[PDB]
């Protein structure tokens, strides 16, 4: 992919917003780059609720490594579009702007598609209760003296 760093994500988001793109003949102010990177970090930590939220492979920049910009995001190829569309929506208010309808729709669609596979994985069924017999059809169990399901 050509979007391999947090700076690539931020530039894509600002181009989508129409703030800093060659089609606009503007360029990214470094302060805006820093602010957008901070917004991306906060948003990503909020999405990935310490493992109980959306899993994307995003690599949070530790404190020690001085420039957070320039590091690989670690996302898969299928998350980049959702990430930078939602980032554009998040950082539109700094400029008293408002992400347009197409950007908002793509943000929603991307977030849903991001969580799809995790939802499929987490749709697991609980085991039998501790008070359910195994039945006599389970001859091996009823011969090894396993008459009830364990549970938990």
């Amino acid at each position: 992919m050509q979007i391999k760093t947090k700076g690539d994500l931020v530039r894509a988001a600002l181009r989508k917003l129409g703030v800093a793109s060659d089609a606009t003949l503007t360029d990214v102010e470094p302060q805006s780059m820093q602010d957008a990177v901070d917004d991306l970090e906060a948003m990503m930590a909020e999405w990935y609720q310490d493992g109980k939220g959306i899993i994307t492979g995003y690599v949070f920049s530790d404190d020690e490594n001085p420039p957070a910009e320039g590091d690989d995001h670690g996302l898969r190829s299928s998350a980049v579009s959702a990430v930078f569309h939602n980032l554009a929506c998040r950082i539109a208010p700094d400029y008293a702007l408002e992400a347009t309808a197409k950007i908002i729709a793509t943000a929603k669609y991307g977030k849903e598609l991001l969580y799809k596979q995790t939802a499929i994985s987490r749709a697991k069924r609980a085991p039998y209760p501790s008070r359910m017999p195994t039945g006599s059809g389970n001859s091996f169990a009823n011969l090894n003296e396993w008459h009830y399901f364990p549970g938990e």
Partner: protein, 54 residues
């Protein structure tokens, strides 16, 4: 709570502890008969191992 006391005084500051086994010696063991018990169950039948074993 004081009804359960088994020593006269508590452990106070510089109280020396004294070891009572000062040489190697094979033990002689006495007890009241109901002081040691053995608890026993069969291996549970739903175990991860013993899956295909009769």
């Amino acid at each position: 709570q004081r009804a359960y006391a088994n020593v006269n005084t508590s452990l106070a500051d510089a109280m020396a502890v004294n070891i009572l086994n000062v040489k190697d010696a094979r033990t002689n063991v006495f007890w009241a008969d109901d002081a040691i018990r053995i608890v026993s169950q069969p291996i549970p039948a739903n175990h991860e191992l013993f899956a295909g074993m009769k």
